[PDB]
């Protein structure tokens, strides 16, 4: 049936037909005058900021292609998916970190691609989201392995850091703080909307 994805990828373009363990941004839609003028500015500025997310995907793909075809070993978690599949309906789910019983180690692991398919849909209102994804690349370096794999994936981590130092420029930073307060207000209204409906 639906895809067995645990990561919170979802936006206006697609990726909403999913079900994860922790928090999820499924979004197409789920007094009265403030709510309807709210919905009007939601549609308008969501279309404009969605075009800005697609432009961010355009200027991210130029480093994303090289950094996805250079290395492949971090494009897959070391713990395979079927151990987390039977937790949907050994490994135990806390707040969001999965715990293993045999060693006791804590993994925030992605498949080194959860960025391009997040910007396929698009909720990257700020470059701090790409900062957080590259910091999760560092977390995938940190959580599992010996010294060589940690320092080499920290090298690729800081390559992507040297890239996001080029994507994060203060004009785009001030535009992203404008749509950051807009999208903070958007996520607040959307959580109260999914609680009231």
């Amino acid at each position: 049936g639906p895809t067995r994805r645990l990561f919170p990828t979802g936006g206006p373009f697609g990726g909403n037909d999913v079900t994860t363990i922790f928090g999820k941004n499924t979004n197409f839609y789920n007094p009265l005058s403030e709510k309807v003028v709210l919905r009007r500015k939601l549609k308008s500025f969501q279309h404009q900021d969605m075009r800005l997310k697609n432009v961010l995907k355009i200027k991210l793909s130029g480093l994303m292609d090289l950094f996805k075809n250079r290395y492949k070993r971090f494009r897959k978690p070391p713990i395979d998916d079927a151990f987390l599949v039977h937790l949907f309906e050994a490994y135990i789910k806390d707040e969001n970190m999965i715990l293993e019983v045999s060693t006791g180690r804590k993994f925030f692991n992605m498949d080194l691609d959860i960025v391009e398919e997040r910007l396929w849909n698009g909720y990257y209102s700020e470059p701090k989201q790409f900062l957080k994804d590259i910091e999760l690349i560092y977390r995938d370096a940190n959580t599992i392995g010996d010294r060589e794999r940690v320092i080499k994936a920290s090298e690729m981590f800081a390559n992507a850091q040297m890239g996001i130092e080029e994507i994060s420029t203060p004009d785009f930073i001030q535009e992203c703080k404008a749509t950051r307060q807009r999208d903070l207000e958007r996520q607040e209204l959307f959580l109260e909307d999914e609680e009231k409906r």
Partner: protein, 44 residues
């Protein structure tokens, strides 16, 4: 010789996990030491 101060050579300049490794590794064997070389590489 009933204790043994353990050497730890460290260079000057990621580095924060190796910093945690050298600080916690010196705090499981309590007779130990921490030595840094060229501290201006890590403290300009």
């Amino acid at each position: 010789d009933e204790r043994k101060i353990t050497f730890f050579m460290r260079k000057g300049a990621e580095a924060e996990r190796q910093l945690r490794l050298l600080f916690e590794e010196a705090k499981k064997h309590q007779p130990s030491i921490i030595f840094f070389d060229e501290i201006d590489g890590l403290a300009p």
